[PDB]
Amino acid sequence: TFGRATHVVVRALPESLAQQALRRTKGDEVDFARAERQHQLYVGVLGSKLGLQVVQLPADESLPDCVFVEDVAVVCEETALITRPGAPSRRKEADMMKEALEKLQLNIVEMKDENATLDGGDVLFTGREFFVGLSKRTNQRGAEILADTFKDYAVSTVPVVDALHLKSFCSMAGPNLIAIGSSESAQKALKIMQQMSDHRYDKLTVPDDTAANCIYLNIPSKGHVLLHRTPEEYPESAKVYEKLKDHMLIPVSNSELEKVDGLLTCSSVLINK
Ligand SMILES: [Zn+2]
């Protein structure tokens, strides 16, 4: 049942996303056209190729980051936690997301606590438990609210250092497999998480930390499927995923979104209805 999904929520790219300062774009210039193509292809893999029912939300120019829907909602089974993003400028994205999730007839829980913040990017759901990164975007209060929302699942926190989100350097690659970056900080984070759990997780170390962020899915007629970064964007990391012969590997470009800190998981919210 882990990795199973029927629907996926995504959101169109606003032009304001490519109209940001160099300091915010890591010094790189965003090719808005290529970014839209990369998103189109990304959605095409999840929709047409994998058969998921796609819910495409309209772009909002006032919300330059509205494309990264993962941050505004954490879904588990039939319950959806509408988060309170660490960045105030993104708090409004919750409106559209909540509306879509309600339309899907899911149990809605909203994070209103003025003292709580949490980005979905800091949430790693293994299928057995939650690991929540304490970062500049997610605080202890936010983690506690998530734990209170999914009471039947263990929830543990991990410090996020030298990275924006917990998943800036990890994500699930299989039923009991955690893709983890090779950096010193990434390996340390995983060690801390593992120490918290009573379950021994397997791990796949990837040379490029951001390449550790991938999307795993269990499709009925295909089996284990994994969307990962391309050999062109991350040569050193692409070959590592090839070690999963039981997985249907799918290279997905994302060079432009990464310029504004968008990784593979950031652009979609998976739902199993
Ligand atoms: Zn993210």
From Swiss-Prot:
> Its Gene Ontology molecular function terms?
amino acid binding; dimethylargininase activity; zinc ion binding
Tissue expression notes: Widely distributed, highest concentrations found in brain, brain cortex and kidney (at protein level).
Q: Where is the active site?
A: 165, 266
Q: Is the Translocase keyword given for this protein?
A: no
**Residues given in the record as substrate binding sites:** 22, 65, 70-71, 90, 137, 260
For this UniProt record, give its keywords in alphabetical order, as a comma-separated list. Answer: Acetylation, Hydrolase, Metal-binding, S-nitrosylation, Zinc
Question: Which Pfam families does the protein's record reference?
Answer: ADI (PF02274)
Q: Which domain of life is it from?
A: Eukaryota
Quote the InterPro entries the UniProt record gives.
Answer: DDAH-like
This entry's Enzyme Commission designation comes to 3.5.3.18
Residues at which Zn(2+) binds = 266
How activity varies with pH? Optimum pH is 7.8.
GO biological process per UniProt: arginine metabolic process; citrulline metabolic process; nitric oxide biosynthetic process; positive regulation of nitric oxide biosynthetic process; protein nitrosylation
Q: Activity regulation here?
A: Copurifies with a tightly bound zinc ion. Activated by release of zinc. His and other agents that promote the release of bound zinc ions activate the enzyme (in vitro). Inhibited by S-nitrosylation. Zinc protects the protein against S-nitrosylation.
Catalytically driven reaction(s): N(omega),N(omega)-dimethyl-L-arginine + H2O = dimethylamine + L-citrulline; N(omega)-methyl-L-arginine + H2O = L-citrulline + methylamine
List S-nitrosocysteine occurrences by residue: 214, 266
Q: How does it assemble?
A: Monomer.
Protein family per UniProt: Belongs to the DDAH family.
What is the role of the protein in this entry?
Hydrolyzes N(G),N(G)-dimethyl-L-arginine (ADMA) and N(G)-monomethyl-L-arginine (MMA) which act as inhibitors of NOS. Has therefore a role in the regulation of nitric oxide generation.
Any idea what this protein is called? Answer: N(G),N(G)-dimethylarginine dimethylaminohydrolase 1
Which organism is this protein's natural source?
A: Bos taurus (Bovine)
Q: Which gene encodes it?
A: DDAH1
